[PDB]
Write a protein that binds this ligand. Sequence first.
Ligand code: HEM
Ligand code: HEM
Ligand code: HEM
Ligand code: HEM
Lengths: 141, 141, 146, 146
Amino acid sequence: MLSPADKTNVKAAWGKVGAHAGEYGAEALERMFLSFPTTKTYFPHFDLSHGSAQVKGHGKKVADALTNAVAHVDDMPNALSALSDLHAHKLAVDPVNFKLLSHCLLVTLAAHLPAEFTPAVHASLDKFLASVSTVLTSKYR
Amino acid sequence: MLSPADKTNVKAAWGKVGAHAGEYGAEALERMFLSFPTTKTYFPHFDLSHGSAQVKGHGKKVADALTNAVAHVDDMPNALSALSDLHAHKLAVDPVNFKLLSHCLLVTLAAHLPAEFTPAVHASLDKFLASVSTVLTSKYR
Amino acid sequence: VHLTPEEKSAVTALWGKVNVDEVGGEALGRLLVVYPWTQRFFESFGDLSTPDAVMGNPKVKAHGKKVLGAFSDGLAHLDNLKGTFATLSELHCDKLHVDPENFRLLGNVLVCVLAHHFGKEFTPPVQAAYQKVVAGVANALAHKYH
Amino acid sequence: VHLTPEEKSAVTALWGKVNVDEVGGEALGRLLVVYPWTQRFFESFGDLSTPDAVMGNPKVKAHGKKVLGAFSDGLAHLDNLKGTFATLSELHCDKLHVDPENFRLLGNVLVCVLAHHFGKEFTPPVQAAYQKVVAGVANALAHKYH
Ligand code: HEM
Ligand code: HEM
Ligand code: HEM
Ligand code: HEM
C-alpha cells in the first residue's frame, strides 16, 4: 500500500526516465534474459539475440504500461486490468519472474539515473514495482 | 480468491479435522522445523525437540487461528488484522516461509483425512491456505 | 544430495511399497487439478475440463506412471542426479519450454500424494528425506536450462 | 561455482575499481532502507529512524566494510565458497538467527549499488556474472544452517 511520498518519488523518478523508457524497458528485458535464463521460457517465439528488434519493441510496450500504471497510481488494480488476465489467465507467468524483472528495472534505472536513485527513491520504486507485480499476478485463482 | 465451492469444501474439510485441529497444528509445525530447518531461525526461544510442549501449545494457537479464519472465510482481513500486524511487523516473517507452513499443513491433513482429501479439496485447501498467507503478509514494508 | 544413510534408507523402503500406477497417476492428476495452468502443456491429452475428468483420463495416467518411473530412476542415482536427468532437462527447456518453478509444485504434490497414501507411516522424518529427493530432482531438471 | 573464465575475469576486473569502504556502506545502508524489517537485527546501531540517519550512521558504515571484506574474500576463492564462508554461516545461523532469505536481498541490493556506481560499465553480461556470484555467496552462507 503506497504512501503519499512513495508516489511523489515514483512520479519524479519515472519523470526523468522520460522518452528514454522503451530504451530502459528493453535493456531491462535483456538484463533479465542473460541473468535469469529461465525467463526465456515465456518467450519461445522471440528473437532474444543481443540487439533484437523484437525485444526492443517489447521493451517499449512494457515501459509504457508502467508509464500508465504510474499515470493511474491510485487505481492500479483496474488501470492495469487487461494486463492481469494476460499474465495471469492467458500466459500464467509464475510470480518469481515478476520479482526478477522488477529487480532488473531497478538495476537499469539505477544505471541510467545516478542522482535520482537515492535510497528513498530506491525504496519507493521497489514498492511501486511489487505493486504492479502484485496486480498482474492476482487473477491467478 | 475463494469462490463458494472452495469455501464450501474448506468448511467441510475443516469441520472434519474437528477436535483434532490442535493435533494437526503440531504435527505440521513439527514437520516444518524438520523438513525446512531455516524456518527454525524464527523460534530460537523454543525447545523444538520431538513432541515437546512449546510446539504442542504453539500448535493449537495456529490451528485455532485457522479455525477462526474458516469461520470468517468470507472476510479474513478483518478477522486476522491482529495476527497480521504480528507476522508482518513484530516478527516480519518472510512470505516464503508461509508457503512452507502451508505445504506441511496439507501434508498433515492429507495423511489424516484420507477419504476427505480429494483433488478438489486439496485444491481448495490450497487456495485457502494461500489466502490466509497473503493476509498475514500484506504490509511487508 | 547430501543424504544421510538413516535418511537414504527411509526413502527407499517406503518407496518399494509404492504402487506406481496409483501414485504416479494421482500426482500428475492433482497438478493439472490443483494448479490449473499446468494443463496448458498437456493440451494434447484431451478432456481436462473437470477434476473428475482429470483423474480418469488414460493419458494423464500413462504419463504420470512415466514421470514416477524417472523419479524412480533418481532414487538409484541419488549421488548423481545431475547426470541422470540431464537429457530430460534439455527436453523440458528446449522442446517443452516449462518454467522450472513448476517442477517444485509437482514434487510437493508428490509429497502430498504419498502421505495421502500412507498416513502414519509417512512420519515427519520420512517426509524430510523425500523433501530432499524432491528438491534434488527439481534442481537436476533445472540444471541444463540456458 | 559454474563461472566461465570470461565471467571470472569480467567479475574481478570490475571488482578492482570498487571502493570497498564506500560500497560496503551503501549496500547494507540500502538494504536497511528498502527493506526496513531487517533493522530488527541491528538495534545496537543507534538511530535508524530515517534514510539519512541510516546512510550516515557510522556503525552502518563500519559494519558494511566488514560485509564486503567477506565478499572480496569469496571472490578470491570462487571455487570453495561453501568452505570460505563455513564459519560465517554457522554464526548467522546459530548466533544471530537470520533467515537466509535475507542474504538474497543483500546480494541483489548489492548488484543494484554496483550498477549505480559504474553505469553503462555494469553491462548486462557483467551483471550476469555478478548475479551468479551473489547467489553462490548466499548459498554458501545458508549451507551450514541446521
Ligand atoms: C513489470 C511487470 C510487467 C509488465 C508491466 C508487463 C507488461 C507487458 C505488456 C505491456 C505486454 C504486451 C501486451 C500486448 O501485447 O498487448 C506483455 C506481454 C507479455 N509479457 Fe509481460 N509484463 C511484465 C512482466 C512480465 C514477465 C515477468 C513475464 C515473464 C517472464 C512477462 C511475459 C510476457 C510475455 C511472454 C508477453 C507476450 C509476448 C507476445 O506473445 O507478444 N511479462 N507484458
Ligand atoms: C497459516 C500460517 C500461520 C498462521 C495461521 C499463524 C498463526 C499464528 C498465531 C495464532 C500466533 C500466536 C499469536 C498470539 O499469541 O497472539 C503466531 C505466532 C507466531 N508465528 Fe505464526 N502463524 C502462521 C505462520 C507462521 C509462519 C510461516 C511463521 C514463520 C516460519 C510464523 C512464525 C511465528 C512466530 C515466531 C510466532 C511467535 C511465537 C512466540 O514467540 O510465542 N508463523 N502465528
Ligand atoms: C517434477 C519433475 C518432472 C519429471 C521428473 C518429469 C518427467 C517427464 C518425463 C520423463 C517425460 C517424458 C520424457 C521422454 O520423452 O522420455 C516428460 C514429458 C513431459 N513433461 Fe515433465 N516431468 C517433471 C515435471 C514436469 C512439469 C512440472 C511439467 C509442466 C508443469 C512437465 C511437462 C512435461 C511435458 C509437456 C511432457 C511431454 C509429454 C508428451 O510427450 O506428451 N514436466 N516429463
Ligand atoms: C552476503 C551476505 C552477508 C555476509 C557476507 C555477511 C557477513 C557478515 C560478517 C563478515 C559479519 C561479522 C562477523 C562477526 O561479527 O563475527 C557479520 C555479522 C553480522 N551479520 Fe552478516 N552477512 C551477510 C548478510 C547478513 C544479513 C542479510 C543479515 C541480517 C539482516 C546479517 C546480520 C548480521 C548481524 C546482526 C551481525 C552481527 C552484528 C553485530 O552485532 O555487530 N548479515 N555478517
